[PDB]
C-alpha cells in the first residue's frame, strides 16, 4: 500500500532535512512534513497498475503483411521481431535485459480484388501459418514439401472463426534477452555493430490452403505479441528521438524538450 | 573523530587518498564477487591473477576547457593494452570482472563548474549516416578519451558517430542518465568521484574483445569559469581498478 | 493532460538576498534542478504515449 | 537553448537590488514542457492520472 | 487442485483458478506481484545517510 | 547484413560487398550487381564468394544479396 | 418484507394521530388502522424490484453511428457519455451523485449500398473498436499507426458472432460521479457553466479492418451501457421537461401537469 | 470456492456461483440487497414526533 | 555528528534554513504561550488562527551602504497589512502574540562590518521640536523600514523625530541597548540573527492599532567595508513569524 | 466548448471566439471563420490564439473550432 502522511508541528532545532549534497549520487528521502506542518492522512492508494507485468502485458500489433490466392505473391514470410513497430519497442527498451514468455495472436482478413471475371462464387478459405525455427528448411513455393510440418509447429484456421492463439516460452540461449548490445559478432571487431544471435526467434510463413474462388482475393495477416511472466533489469532513459531503423539505434539529433517564451512563462509556446 | 570527506582505497600494490570526497556509489547495491558453482556453464578451471590484475591503472589526462562537451571510455577497451590485465584478456577466450572507477579534478575556490560521472551499461551508440553503423576506430579509443561534439555531425556516406552531447550519442535525453550509477564533481564542494560497479551481463562470462559491457562518461553540465589571473589549465584524470577478475579458455594470444 | 478543473498551482523562485562575491571571483553563476517523486506518489489508467509515432515499418 | 546543455542551467548573478524573480513554472508534471521529458514525466505520459507529493532539489 | 485467490477490490472476494495444460508457459499473467525495493536505484551509497544529519561533515 | 551499405568510392576499382547470413536464412543464395553480373547455383574478386565476399572488380552500383528469408542491398557511388 | 396490517377496534380518547403539522417538514407515519377499524392482514409483498440496482441494471442504447468501407467516412468516433439519450439519462438523474461499474455491449451491423459495380462477391468483415483514455493520441486516418493498440484497449470482432462485451470499473478522480454541477471550471467564474472534468470517460473509435468486397458497404455500431454495483445519494425531483442539449440542463417552460375540465371532474380532458 | 445462495421464490431453493476473473468489477450485479432506511428523507426532525401526540404544544 | 552553525526553523507552511548561525536568543528565557484562565479578564471565547496567522512574513529589503546609520520597524505595524494576521487585527478589538525575528545578511570573507539586532520593548521616541510629539507617519512605516539619521535633526515647529543614531531616538546611550534581547551580525563569523520574543505588556491583551509593544532595531556599529572589485550592493532582509496569536472583541473592520 | 455560442454584436468590430479543450481532445487544432480567414499548422486579435482565443477584428459570422474529437461552432449576427 502506498505510504501514509504523518502529522507534524512546529520545529526549531539543528536538524536539517532540507539541506543535503546531490553530488553523493543519492536521492533525498524527505517527506512533506519535514518542511511544513502536516495533518495525519491515511492513504489507501495502491501502485498495482505500475508493476512491470501490467505495464507490459497487453497485446500489440507488431507487423502485418499480405498475400494473394493467385499471381506472384502466393505466400508471406516475416522474421519474428518486435523492433519493426514503435510502441512496444519503446516500452520494452525501458530496460536493458528482459525475460518473458510470449502469447501470440493473429488477425487474418480477406478482400475481393477488382477484375472482369464473371459468375464468381467463393468457397470458404482456410489459411496455414507455419513457424520455422532458425536453421530449418524454408518454403520456396506455395506447394513446397516443407509445408508437411512434420516437426515445425503449424496452425490451420478457417475464415469466420475466433482468432488463432498460442503460447511461446523463453527461447534465448543466453540467461536473459538483450535490448542493447555494445559490440560485434566478429572477434576482429569488423562487420555489423550492435548485432548478435541472443534474440533470434525464427521466421513465420503464411498461405492459403485453397484458392476458394475463380476470382482474385487478397489476405492480410496481423501479428500480436503479449509478454507474460516478465522479468527486467537495469532501467534505461526513455527514447527521446524518432526510430529510424529496425536493426540499430540510429537517430536524428533532437531538442532536449519543447521551448516556451521565457523562464517565467507559465504556458507552452 | 574523523572527517567523512577523507577516504583511502587500497588495491593490490596501489592506494588512492582523497581529502574531499562525497562518498562511494556502489553499483546497484552489489559488491563484486566471483562466479559461483550454481551459476557457471564453462567447465575448465578458471584463473584468478588477483593482485597482478586487480589494481589501479591510471590513464591519460584530458583538459577541461570552457567549451568542452565531454569524454567517454569503454572500460574493457581502456585497459586492453595495460599490464597483466591486458595480457590475460589477450590469451583467454572468456573473462569476467567488476570495476572501481575514480575520477579526479581539483581547482581553487574561485574556479566553478560541475561534471556528471556516470557508468552506463551497454552504451550502444548510433552512426551519423542512418544506413551505416559507427566504425570501431570511431567508437573505441584504447589509450585516449573519446570526445563528444556540441554541434550535430554531418551524414555523408561515412561511418562516424552522432556524438551530440545533448543526446549522449544514444539518442536519449542527457539529463535522464541519472538512473545509471553516478556521482557529480562540483568544484566548490567535490574533488573526486568514485563508483564501484559489479559485473553486468545477460551471460555468465563474455569475450572481452568483441563486447564492451560498460562505458564511462564525463559530461560538464555547468561550464568551467574563472576570472583572469587564475590557473587556466585544468586537467581531469581517470583511474580504474578491476575487481574479482577471472579468465577461462586459454589458447594462443590474439583476437581474430 | 492539461485541465483547468484539476489545476496544480505555481512554482517560483526569488532572490531573498543578492549574490555577493569578492574580487577575482565570477559574479555570474548557475543553479541546477532535479525532480523526483515522494513515497505517496502513484499513477492510474495505462494509455499510449503522444511522444513516439510512425509512418512506415522501421527497417 | 534546447539544442544545447544550456537548457539545464538556471542563471543567477549579482543585482543592484533584491526581490527579483529567478524562474517560474506550473505544477503540471506530465504536460508542462519543463517536466514532460524528465524520467517522472516520461513515466507519467503512459497513464491518465497521477497523485502524490513531488521533490524539487536545487544545487 | 483448484486455487482460490482474492480479487482486486476497493477500499473504505475470491475467485477460482485451475490449470489445464502441462507447460507453465501456458498459464495466465502474474498481475498481483506488489513487491517494491527502490533502494537499489535510489540512495545507493556505501555509508548510510540519515535525513536529519548533514550529508557532508 | 552487408557491412557499410552506403559509401562513395572515388578513384581498377574494388567494390566491396561483404555480407553475413542469419541462422534463419536457409534458402538458396543469389547475388546480383546493378548499374551487370549475376551469381546463381566486371568479375568477382573472391573464388569462395559463397563464404561472404560478393565484391567485384571494375554512377551508382547496387549489390543485392538474397538468401530466403533475408534480403540485403548496398549502394556505392563510383566517381 | 413489506409491513403487515394490524387489527383495531373503536376508539374514544384524546389521542389524535390524524392531526399534525406539515410545517415541521415531517411526513406523517399513520397506518390505516389509526382512522378506521381494520382486520389483521399478513402481507407477503416484497419491494425487491424497487432497489436502485434492479431499477438501473438493464442495458440501454446510448448512441449509434455509421462508417463505410470506402469514401470519406472510413472510421467513427464518439466521446463516451450517457446524456445523448433520454431514457437512461432521466433514470440516472433521479440522484445527485452516483457510483457504478459499467458493462459495455456493442451491436454492429452492415448493409450493402446501391452502386453500378458488377461481379461483387464479399468476404467476411472484421471490425476494430478502440478506446482511448483522455489524453492519448487519436487516429487521423483509418491506417493511422495509433491503431497498433500497444496500451489502449481494443476489441476485434467478426460479423456473425456474438456481440462483444466488456466490464469497465469506476474511473472518476472524485469519490463519486456527478449528475449536476453548479459552478465553473474557471476560478474567475467566466467560461462555460455546469461543465467539469469529474465524469470524463474518453473516446471510442471504430473501423473496418478489411474492406471485404469491391462494392460499397456501410456499417453501424450501437453502444449499450449497463450500470453495475450501484451507489446513489441525494434524491432529486424527476425531469418534468423535454431535454434540449447534452451538455447542460436547458429546457422550455412547461405546465406543472395536464389539465381537466373542473376541480370535480373524474376524467382527463 | 463455490458460493451457494437462495433464489427468488414465491410465498404461501439454492443456486451456485463461482468467480472467474480477478478484478471484482467483472462480477454479476447485486440484486438481493433489500436494506431500507427511509427515516433520512422522511421524519428528519431534531426532536422526535410521537404519532398520538399533537405535533405542536 | 552535526554543526551548531546549521539550524532550521519551521512555522506553518514556511521553513528557514541557515548554514551560519550563532544560536537562538530566547526573550527573557520565556517561550511564548497562550493566555491562561487565571490571568484573563475578557470573557468571550478567543480565536486562534494558528498556521493561518503563525507563519513567516518577509518584508522589503534595505541596502547596507558604507554610511548607513540604521533602520527600525514597529513589529505590530510591520505586519498590519500582511495576510490573515492583518485581517484578524483589523476585525478584532484585542490581540495578543509573541514573535520570532530572523535577520539575514550575507557577504564574502573580504566584506567586513558588524550589526546589532535588538528587540526593544516600549521604544517610545522623542520629537525634534520639544513642545510637539512625533507624527504617526514619521514614527511608523508599515511596509517600509524607518531610517536613523547621523546628524541631529533641526527643530522648527514640526512633528519630526530626533532620529540621532548615537541616542537611538530614545535619548539614551546606544551602547547600553544590550540589556534588551539581542544578537550581533558580524560578517566574518555570522550570517543571520534570531530572537524569540514573548508577549510583553502591563495588561493581559491590548489593542494592536494604537499601541506597539516592541520595535526591531538594526544598527551598524562597524561600517561596511570592501576593496574594489567586490560586490557593492549588500541587502538586509527581515522575516518575522507571530507566535501563539489570539484575538478577542469581534466587530466591523476598521480602526477609528 | 465556446463561450456564448449565440450572440448579436450591434455597432472596428471585435468578434469573440474564446474556446476550451477537453482532456479527450488531442488532434491537430484548426480554426475557421465564415460569412473569410483560416488558421492551420479580417485579422486575429490574439498572437497566442492556440491558448484559447480565436477572436477576430473586422450578416452572420460563424466561428468553427476543431480539435479531434471535439467540434464547436459560434454564430454572431453583426448589424
Curated annotation (Swiss-Prot), chains A, G:
Location in the cell: Virion; Host cytoplasm
Description of how the protein assembles with itself and partners: Interacts with capsid protein VP0, and capsid protein VP3 to form heterotrimeric protomers. Five protomers subsequently associate to form pentamers which serve as building blocks for the capsid. Interacts with capsid protein VP2, capsid protein VP3 and capsid protein VP4 following cleavage of capsid protein VP0. Interacts with host CD55. Interacts with host CXADR.
Functional description taken from the UniProt entry: Forms an icosahedral capsid of pseudo T=3 symmetry with capsid proteins VP2 and VP3. The capsid is 300 Angstroms in diameter, composed of 60 copies of each capsid protein and enclosing the viral positive strand RNA genome. Capsid protein VP1 mainly forms the vertices of the capsid. Capsid protein VP1 interacts with host CD55 and CXADR to provide virion attachment to target host cells. This attachment induces virion internalization. Tyrosine kinases are probably involved in the entry process. After binding to its receptor, the capsid undergoes conformational changes.
Protein name listed in UniProt: Capsid protein VP1
Gene source species: Coxsackievirus B3 (strain Nancy)
Lineage: Viruses, Riboviria, Orthornavirae, Pisuviricota, Pisoniviricetes
Residues of the full protein shown: 583 to 851 of 2185
From Swiss-Prot, chain D:
Top-level taxon: Viruses
Subcellular location field: Virion; Host cytoplasm
Subunit structure: Interacts with capsid protein VP0 and capsid protein VP1 to form heterotrimeric protomers. Five protomers subsequently associate to form pentamers which serve as building blocks for the capsid. Interacts with capsid protein VP4 in the mature capsid. Interacts with protein 2C; this interaction may be important for virion morphogenesis.
Protein's job: Forms an icosahedral capsid of pseudo T=3 symmetry with capsid proteins VP2 and VP3. The capsid is 300 Angstroms in diameter, composed of 60 copies of each capsid protein and enclosing the viral positive strand RNA genome.
Protein's name in the database: Capsid protein VP3
Lineage, opening ranks: Viruses, Riboviria, Orthornavirae, Pisuviricota, Pisoniviricetes
UniProtKB/Swiss-Prot annotation, chains F, J:
Tissue localization of expression: Expressed in pancreas, brain, heart, small intestine, testis, prostate and at a lower level in liver and lung. Isoform 5 is ubiquitously expressed. Isoform 3 is expressed in heart, lung and pancreas. In skeletal muscle, isoform 1 is found at the neuromuscular junction and isoform 2 is found in blood vessels. In cardiac muscle, isoform 1 and isoform 2 are found at intercalated disks. In heart expressed in subendothelial layers of the vessel wall but not in the luminal endothelial surface. Expression is elevated in hearts with dilated cardiomyopathy.
Record-annotated disulphide pairs: 17-63
Single biological process term from Gene Ontology: mitochondrion organization
Positions annotated as glycosylated: 57
Key words of the record: Cell adhesion, Cell junction, Cell membrane, Disulfide bond, Glycoprotein, Host cell receptor for virus entry, Host-virus interaction, Immunoglobulin domain, Lipoprotein, Membrane, Palmitate, Phosphoprotein, Receptor, Repeat, Secreted, Signal, Tight junction, Transmembrane, Transmembrane helix
Annotated GO MF terms: beta-catenin binding; cell adhesion molecule binding; cell adhesive protein binding involved in AV node cell-bundle of His cell communication; connexin binding; identical protein binding; integrin binding; PDZ domain binding; signaling receptor binding
Post-translational modification comment from the UniProt entry: N-glycosylated.
Record domain Ig-like C2-type: where: 1-77
UniProt note: domains: The Ig-like C2-type 1 domain mediates homodimerization and interaction with JAML. The PDZ-binding motif mediates interaction with MPDZ and MAGI1.
Name of the protein in its database record: Coxsackievirus and adenovirus receptor
Species of origin: Homo sapiens
Lineage per the UniProt record: Eukaryota, Metazoa, Chordata, Craniata, Vertebrata
Span covered, complete protein: 21 to 136 of 365
